[PDB]
Paper text:
To obtain insights into the mechanism that prevents DcpS from forming a productive active site around mRNA substrates longer than two nucleotides, we determined the crystal structure of DcpS in complex with a capped dinucleotide (note: DcpS contains the H268N inactivating mutation). The complex crystallized in space group P212121, with two dimers per asymmetric unit. The final model was refined to 2.9-Å resolution with good geometry. In this structure, DcpS is in the asymmetric conformation, with the N-terminal lid domain flipped over such that the substrate is tightly embeded in the closed active site. The methylated guanine cap structure is tightly embedded in the active site and stabilized by stacking interaction with Trp-161. Importantly, the structure also displays clear density for the mRNA body of the capped dinucleotide. This reveals the path of the mRNA inside the closed active site and shows that the RNA body has no sequence specific interaction within the binding site. The second nucleotide points away from the cap structure, toward a narrow opening between the N- and C-terminal domains and fully occupies this region of the active site. However, with a diameter of ∼7 Å, the channel is too small to accommodate a putative third nucleotide. This is confirmed by modeling of a capped trinucleotide into the closed active site, which shows that the van der Waals radii of a third nucleotide and residues of the exit channel significantly overlap.
Author numbering:
A (entry chain A): 7 to 55, 62 to 182, 185 to 346
B (entry chain B): 6 to 59, 66 to 154, 160 to 195, 201 to 344
The structure:
């Protein structure tokens, strides 16, 4: 299915290019419907290898590990103790693929606006701004469409072959953990999982009250007690960065689980987007009974985000004015 | 030739660094029993050297090796609703689409070996009691070059902004670069000397911090002719900080280079420090339990954070490998 759709993709324009991270997003069409492809070069590989078994960390004995797959070298130049050149390395679908590809199709305007390159703004969202600007947006943006994949995973067996943990009695307390769409699933250094809760009344951290703290504590404990054993303790419980996003892309409470060794894709682990789950728990001690409903939350938003023109832009200008920040002359 | 000959003789010793963000790998080894460093980096995808309309949205994908044109083989990972994702093999070629950059340092010096070593990190949960027992005595032992910059003119040629009036001898600061405007990275070092980390910020410091937030955003854009806006600066502090003298990092919100340096678990937004002081009571961050990523090379790791992390995991009922 995947292959068939990639083969029909017709290029329209380049949405974004990041040579630091080797990520690319493409706009196109499939059967005259908009489509988005995101590509990422793979990382280098390392050897995969009482009666306990310990993981061999960072070894280079196997055929495709490290630089064993070099077929061809070419020097660019050299001087003193330095040599600079280029290499071609043997690619192979099973053992050394060249790049990961994601496809969104049919892609919606929200998807295209998200992936187009755009300016970002550090916004300060007060409680009243949330009530006025964001909450009405959330209720609209709770389409059974923009969340169809979440329900697909929860109730229709989607990616069930990949699920790593599932805690469900028929109720609202259970959850499952599975590989994140971002993870290529081969390099443990980039391990990225998402925990999806079954309860539906928490759309964002704004909905977490003081009474939710013990439930959140339990999720933090379960994740760290389970995830390392799924990977033969190749990643330890203290090596998992467990976090939520505000604003999230999808308005259903989901928890991100990332190898501490991962310096991070985009904003997924960045201050201004990511908040540690441990921090969510601790902050509920100090906010009121209504919890994050009472917090003024400062975060990074893109100019293409629907909320920008829906009021965050106008409110950011007024916030800058109130803070005594100059209004930038038109002369520059 | 020579280069190829040296790479073939390289005998792997250990991995210095593996970075899945940048797709970089550094290997320590030997050649003729001398230390050598090899660095490999995946190449970026390629685009046409022409454009399809008078920034990356105008790139094109017409040439043989551009974009994903070289895909020979596809394999699905999974799919869900409108989302499909998988892996691909793409035609490689030395002249038009090489696979990776490959550099050699040989003989590499110990200075060379350092710099390339990336330490491993561990999430610790540092309570108020832990700071007083483990962290605070370490900071006191820490008695430096920072004072050379502040009071002896070091890097004065490089300073971007410096407070001078007696009025803010204490509440003032200076800003200088960290050693393309998208990659703007400045550090504000404050003139007060009693704040070594965020632990020392009290409620009474909230207004002082707000003013710093306002000064930074009012000054930096003008130093760059308003090419970056005040709301395009990611202004943050670190815990643990890189030096135990309070300082604020000022980063282009779009800086593409950065990884761990801006990550939750290390970086905290300045606005968040300000907001949290409304709730932490008079002593501020002294009362906070701070969960953050600590490095294995840090003195605090073997000084008590390791031992405390293992006990925390026991108390929380988390399985771990012992000893």
């Amino acid at each position: 299915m995947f292959a068939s759709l990639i083969k029909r993709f017709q290029f329209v324009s380049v949405l974004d290019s990041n040579p630091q991270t080797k990520v690319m997003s493409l706009l196109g069409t499939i059967d005259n419907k908009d489509a988005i492809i995101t590509a990422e070069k793979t990382h280098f590989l390392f050897d995969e290898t009482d009666g306990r078994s310990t993981p061999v960390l960072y070894n280079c004995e196997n055929e495709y590990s490290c630089i064993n797959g070099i077929q061809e070298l070419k020097e660019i130049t050299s001087n003193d103790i330095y040599y600079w050149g280029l290499s071609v390395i043997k690619q192979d679908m099973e053992s050394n693929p060249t790049a990961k590809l994601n496809l969104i199709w049919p892609a919606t305007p929200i998807h295209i606006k998200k992936y187009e390159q755009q300016n970002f703004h550090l916004v300060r969202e007060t409680p009243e701004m949330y009530k006025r600007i964001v909450q009405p947006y959330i209720e609209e943006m709770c389409n059974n469409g923009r969340l169809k994949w979440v329900n697909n995973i929860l109730y229709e067996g989607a990616e069930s072959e990949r699920v790593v943990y599932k805690d469900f009695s028929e109720k609202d307390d259970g959850f499952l953990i599975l590989p994140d769409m971002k993870w290529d699933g081969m390099n443990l250094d980039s391990l990225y999982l998402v925990a999806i809760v079954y309860r539906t009344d928490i759309k964002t951290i704004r909905d977490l009250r003081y009474s939710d703290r013990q439930w959140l504590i339990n999720l933090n404990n379960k994740i760290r007690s389970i995830v390392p054993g799924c990977y033969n303790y190749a990643v330890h419980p203290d090596e998992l960065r467990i976090l939520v996003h505000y604003q999230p892309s999808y308005y259903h409470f989901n928890i991100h689980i990332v190898n501490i060794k991962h310096p991070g894709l985009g904003n997924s682990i960045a201050a201004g987007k990511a908040i540690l789950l441990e921090d969510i728990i601790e902050m509920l001690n100090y906010l009121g009974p209504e919890g994050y409903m009472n917090k003024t939350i400062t975060y990074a938003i893109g100019e293409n985000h629907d909320l920008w023109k829906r009021g965050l832009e106008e409110e950011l200008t007024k916030q800058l004015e109130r803070d005594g920040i100059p209004k930038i002359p038109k002369i520059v």
